[PDB]
From a paper:
In macaques, vaccine-induced nAbs  had epitopes overlapping that of CH103, bound only open trimers, and neutralized rare tier 2 viruses. The antibody clonal lineage most similar to CH103 we identified was an IGHV4-J, CH505 differential-binding clonal lineage (DH522) with autologous tier 1, and heterologous tier 1 and weak tier 2 neutralization activities derived from memory B cells of RM-5556 immunized with additive CH505 Envs. DH522 lineage mAbs did not neutralize tier 2 CH505 TF, neutralized 7% of a panel of 199 [name]-1 primary isolates, and blocked the binding of CH103 lineage Ab (CH106) to CH505 TF gp120.
For comparison, we found that the DH522 lineage antibodies bound natively glycosylated and glycan-deleted CH505 TF gp120 Envs equally well, but did not neutralize [name]-1 pseudoviruses bearing these Envs nor bound free N-glycans.
Residue numbers in the entry:
A (entry chain L): 2 to 6, 8 to 27, 27A, 27B, 27C, 28 to 95, 95A, 96 to 106, ...
B (entry chain H): 2 to 35, 35A, 36 to 52, 52A, 53 to 82, 82A, 82B, 82C, ...
Write the structure that this text describes.
């Protein structure tokens, strides 16, 4: 906070969006010094714009910036999937400090539907010696980023022992997620088959492992 | 020009966080601002403070100035951060960053070059190194003539673990999946790689699991089930 941005904006592929940044007369309105920053999950913030409208070499044409009074604006044209990120404005403030905006999370809508590939692994022999068994179900290449996972043991639903991650974007702009079934070696060996079932957009993939 | 954060990923509440930024590819006594910025989870970016290369003057985020000291050592070519009386709300990714300026009273300054970020977790709970187990190759979910294999990295704390394959010489078809967090308080993740079925038996495959918060490294050989 202290500089105000919309929490999120959503636009379709190809369209253009504007991200605003409301500050004060000691900041945005005091200097020609608002910068913008692109922040992809996992890497450091990348400078997009400095001194209100300047682009560093290497930042695309589609990114532009301006300001009017105490409000600065960032405009992205020709929105692509890759543009999905958190975007921050910031500025020098009188008294020699620095303040960021709260950040805007950009979603880009209209991307192609992709069903997940599902990779299920049995516990290792080594882990089974230690009397525990972890089934690893890796879910990849899906869009949109929402799946429901269910585990079965000889056709019977399992609820305990299960932890599933929130979908996260791969380099190729599709989504990945994993689900884990934590068992004891006793449990694992006493069933004939375990199954990992992933439902995406009304369709289900099922992989099975066996002792 | 490069910046690189180092320091403990784990710090007990009430105690003092210490980070150092080693600056390469340019001197640290030049005409620049050296900055610390953090990002608590879900929160946004937050400037912490800065030190000025040529003279060493510091400035701090007003709501953190009583808890923060930023220093610089011109030999070693580093600057550093100390944050006192830490709490759970200081759990964050910390970045160092260079502030480039022209005339501060007209244009301020901006952050052109950044470090990569180090996660710091505030927690009374102790360090826990991972147990690594093979994920045996399976062909059914990949393309023809290939198979996927990997490593389960189990029960560590805190984040992060990094995985590479065959000492970084195998980077094609690698996918490391985001960690999962158990009710135990520990994390686990998996890294997999898609390789040619023909190379199994011939080519040795090793996941290089790196867990810096516990100073533990594991190079695990991934075998077929015997």
């Amino acid at each position: 906070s202290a500089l105000t941005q919309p929490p999120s904006v959503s636009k379709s592929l190809g369209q253009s969006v504007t991200i605003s940044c409301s500050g004060t007369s000691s900041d945005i309105g005091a200097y020609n010094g608002v910068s913008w920053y692109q922040h992809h999950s996992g890497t450091a913030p990348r400078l997009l714009i400095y001194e209100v409208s300047k682009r560093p070499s290497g930042v695309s044409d589609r990114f532009s910036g301006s300001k009017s009074g105490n409000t600065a604006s960032l405009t992205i044209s020709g929105l692509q999937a890759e543009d999905e990120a958190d975007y921050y404005c910031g500025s020098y403030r009188s008294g020699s400090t620095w303040v960021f905006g709260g950040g805007t999370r950009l979603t880009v809508l209209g991307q192609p539907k992709a069903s997940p590939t599902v990779t299920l692994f049995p516990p290792s022999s080594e882990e089974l010696q230690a009397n525990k068994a972890t089934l690893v179900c890796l879910i990849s290449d899906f869009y949109p980023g929402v799946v429901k996972v269910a585990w079965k043991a000889d056709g019977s639903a399992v609820n305990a022992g299960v932890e599933t991650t929130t979908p996260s974007k791969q380099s190729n702009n599709k989504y990945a997620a994993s689900s884990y079934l934590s068992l004891t070696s006793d449990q694992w060996k006493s069933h004939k088959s375990y199954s990992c079932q992933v439902t995406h957009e009304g369709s289900t993939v099922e992989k099975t492992v066996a002792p | 020009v490069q910046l690189q954060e180092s320091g403990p990923g784990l710090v007990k509440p009430s105690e003092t966080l210490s980070l150092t930024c080693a600056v390469s590819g340019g001197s640290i006594g030049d005409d620049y601002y050296w900055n610390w910025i953090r990002q608590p989870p879900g929160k946004g970016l937050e400037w912490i403070g800065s030190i000025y290369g040529s003279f060493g003057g510091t400035n701090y985020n007003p709501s953190l100035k009583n808890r923060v000291t930023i220093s610089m050592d011109t030999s070693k070519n580093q600057f550093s951060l100390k944050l006192s009386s830490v709490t759970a709300a200081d759990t964050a990714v910390y970045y160092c960053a260079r502030g480039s300026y022209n005339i501060v009273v007209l244009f301020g300054y901006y952050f052109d070059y950044w470090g990569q970020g180090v996660l710091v977790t505030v927690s009374s709970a102790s360090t826990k190194g991972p147990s690594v187990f093979p994920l045996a190759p399976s062909s059914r979910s990949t393309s023809e003539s290939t198979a996927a294999l990997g490593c389960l990295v189990k029960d560590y704390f805190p984040e992060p673990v990094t995985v590479s394959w065959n000492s970084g010489s195998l980077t094609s078809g690698v996918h490391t999946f985001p960690a999962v967090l158990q009710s135990s308080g520990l994390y686990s993740l998996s890294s997999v790689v898609t390789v040619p079925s023909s190379s199994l038996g011939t080519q040795t495959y090793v996941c290089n699991v790196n867990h810096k918060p516990s100073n533990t490294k594991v190079d695990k050989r991934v075998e077929i089930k015997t």
